[PDB]
Amino acid sequence: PQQLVERLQEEKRIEAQKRKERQEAHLYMQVQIVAEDQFCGHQGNDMYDEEKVKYTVFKVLKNSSLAEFVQSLSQTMGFPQDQIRLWPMQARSNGTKRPAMLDNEADGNKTMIELSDNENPWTIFLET
């Protein structure tokens, strides 16, 4: 129950400085996104697959909510925003493979800087 609010505080504490509410600027944090058709459509083609296109870099406000990123990603790929699960990159090789989604509760309400750890372009996989 309490894990959702606990984790959210541990991250969001930076907001007194980094959530500095302003216009679009260098706060345009880049995020590397890739989708995959294999787990749904079965189009395993080598053409212009809008599924398996190059790392789609969305440059958006780190100081603003992940909610704006979700709705943007929803329209561009056609994924339901309620079902947009973000999966962060790890040391994903022989020795370590820990794939998990972000908490859709916390990580659709607070800022995306808390999740990135102030890096750009932040590599991520999209899930429905």
Side-chain angles (χ1 to χ4, degrees), residues 79-104:
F79 283 46
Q81 61 173 215
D82 186 74
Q83 292 184 211
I84 294 193
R85 286 80 190 197
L86 290 65
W87 293 58
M89 109 301 303
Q90 58 283 148
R92 201 278 280 118
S93 301
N94 178 91
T96 301
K97 181 187 65 175
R98 185 62 186 189
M101 70 298 288
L102 279 311
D103 275 285
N104 186 213

Side-chain angles (χ1 to χ4, degrees), residues 14 18 29 62-63 111-118:
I14 82 296
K18 187 56 57 60
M29 176 199 137
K62 57 173 62 63
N63 57 323
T111 71
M112 70 189 307
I113 197 58
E114 322 184 11
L115 300 173
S116 60
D117 189 73
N118 298 267

Side-chain angles (χ1 to χ4, degrees), residues 17-99:
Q17 303 176 329
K18 187 56 57 60
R19 188 185 168 270
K20 195 286 177 298
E21 185 195 280
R22 59 176 298 192
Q23 65 171 89
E24 62 184 275
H26 73 277
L27 299 308
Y28 250 38
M29 176 199 137
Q30 296 87 331
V31 65
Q32 262 184 30
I33 315 300
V34 278
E36 176 62 73
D37 178 279
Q38 183 183 32
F39 60 69
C40 51
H42 295 97
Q43 177 187 29
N45 289 89
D46 185 67
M47 62 182 64
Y48 186 180
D49 299 63
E50 300 98 317
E51 322 300 274
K52 285 84 86 292
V53 282
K54 277 59 273 179
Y55 268 110
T56 188
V57 52
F58 300 128
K59 38 280 163 186
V60 291
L61 291 307
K62 57 173 62 63
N63 57 323
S64 190
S65 59
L66 201 287
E68 302 199 308
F69 174 63
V70 179
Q71 68 176 271
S72 297
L73 229 188
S74 173
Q75 301 308 272
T76 190
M77 301 197 182
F79 283 46
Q81 61 173 215
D82 186 74
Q83 292 184 211
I84 294 193
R85 286 80 190 197
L86 290 65
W87 293 58
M89 109 301 303
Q90 58 283 148
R92 201 278 280 118
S93 301
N94 178 91
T96 301
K97 181 187 65 175
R98 185 62 186 189

